[PDB]
Design a binder for this molecule. Sequence first.
Ligand code: RIO
Ligand code: AKG
Ligand code: NI
Length: 282
Amino acid sequence: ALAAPPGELTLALTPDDKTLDPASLDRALAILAEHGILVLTGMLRTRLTDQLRTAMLDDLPEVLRQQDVPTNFVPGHVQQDPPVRESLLFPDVLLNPVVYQITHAVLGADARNAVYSGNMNLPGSHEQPVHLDEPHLWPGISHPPYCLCVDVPLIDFTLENGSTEYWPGSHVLNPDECYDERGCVLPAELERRRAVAPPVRFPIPVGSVVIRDGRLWHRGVPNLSAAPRPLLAMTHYTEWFDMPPIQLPDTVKSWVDGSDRHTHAHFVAGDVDHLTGDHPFA
Ligand SMILES: NC[C@H]1O[C@H](O[C@H]2[C@H](O[C@@H]3O[C@H](CO)[C@@H](O)[C@H]3O)[C@@H](O)[C@H](N)C[C@@H]2N)[C@H](N)[C@@H](O)[C@@H]1O
Ligand SMILES: O=C(O)CCC(=O)C(=O)O
Ligand code: NI
């Protein structure tokens, strides 16, 4: 049982750090290339994580009221987008200078965030199948990354409350007949991999940011605590990967648009309904 993020995957920062020195950036990139997952501790202030946690636990009842509750693979892994009210859209979350320094270095200067989503892992949730969030672009081909997932826990993640299982080094594996249509890893390839590089699961304190290859094998696991475990998710993509834009209110256009940290965004004159997208001119 691991008690903290492993040294091999971890870089420790303060919220005041606005760029990595060249040696830290080199280490960040070497970790993403070799392991496909990088844990950055001490990035986000309590003031932001408190407001986002509160907003998502306040919204959970509206999500559970829906006729079909949207879930990822298995019961208890609920799909919940964080709010896109002006008051809960934070430059240090959407446009984090350290996150974009890393994604610029891996994906290029034209890399863009195209995801503002979340994962609410409920008490008593089931085991997800091992999967990738974004696939390899062709079967049986080694190619570099085209996307980096940026995962922001909104409480302390523990072994008990459903810290995500990650498969280090799995992001480069793409043999023939390795994935099904849903992005789940075939059992034969899981067992081959398990024997060479088994998965890891570790606590991640709130304030941390996880950056990983969008193709990294991982799974949500049971939340065996008394409280829902909220996770905020973003994903940076190369410029040339087709994605629907994030719906944002035009109140944040001034600072989101024309930043050197790109967002694939559509700016809406009214209020955006993050929970159902049933707002006018959706
Ligand atoms: N890491 C961020 C998010 O990843 C997944 O969602 C992505 C989605 O992935 C689907 O969901 C499965 C993994 O749960 C994949 O196999 C695809 O079918 C992808 O197809 C979309 N183009 C973009 C979505 N952001 C998750 N579903 C979502 O809950 C999570 O917040
Ligand atoms: O929230 C988690 O730990 C896992 C969620 C997930 O990977 C997913 O839904 O794709
Ligand atoms: Ni996933």
